Amino acid sequence: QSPAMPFLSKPPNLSPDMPGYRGFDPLRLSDAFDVNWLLEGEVKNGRVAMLACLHFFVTEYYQFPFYAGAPKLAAPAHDYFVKSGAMIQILVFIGFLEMVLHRGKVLYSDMEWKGRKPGELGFNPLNLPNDKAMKDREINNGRLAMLGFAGIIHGEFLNGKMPIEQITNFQP
Amino acid sequence: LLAGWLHIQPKFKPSLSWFKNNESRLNHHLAGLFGVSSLAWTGHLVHVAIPASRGQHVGWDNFISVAPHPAGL
Amino acid sequence: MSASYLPSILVPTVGLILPFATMAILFVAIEK
């Protein structure tokens, strides 16, 4: 019944209206947790991973002049900017954005979806078309970015090698 | 945890008569839980622990080939 | 140890974050 896994029954709490629906939930986490939370969590983890994948792609032929002389490897970079006191400013600013975008209701118990489908945080300054298949395009790019990011950092931990150097001609 | 979960699913909930089968539980617990565990454990001591005590490495890698006594069975 | 960073992440998690989450979860559960 599930489009993605026909041998499994359709996840009941999922619906085709939701963006990026293939009826893919073999563990049935949509039974364990509220779909609206998972949906919000999916798009957010995506949007954060999207920016994380770009961060690694830009800071490799560049590294902004004023922060020059810092390693572009994941763990060394983390250790440098925490020591610097830059990551603590970013933490509080992300903490600020989280409270502002969700307007106080931040808890799984508190967070509500009155006149907003999951993902709609009211951020569309250019005013591009939202209510269409554009949500499915965000999801697909977000899902790819989450696996993408995971592929970058694990490559960075394995052989201490750059994202773009990996796709030249190298095997262990 | 899988077994625990399985046995409170409707088809796998054992009946009250199953739980009060004294003779069966005693046979299995004596011969199986105590008896066979002690037999299997003897296997460990003879195959692994006693060799290890004599500086002979026996593990999963070689235990098929390495006889715990020269005279075999 | 090999992954000598792990205690710096997991001890706060098990010691601060998870107990607060569990207290919060149980509070709501026993007050509704």
Partner: peptide, 28 residues
């Protein structure tokens, strides 16, 4: 010596026990 990979393999299997534990807990 136990490698980073071995410690992380342990953590995913402990995660699996977590999943199965919650499944049992929720039903009991």
């Amino acid at each position: 010596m136990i490698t980073d990979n071995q410690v992380f393999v342990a953590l995913i299997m402990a995660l699996v026990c977590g999943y199965l534990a919650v499944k049992l807990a929720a039903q009991l």
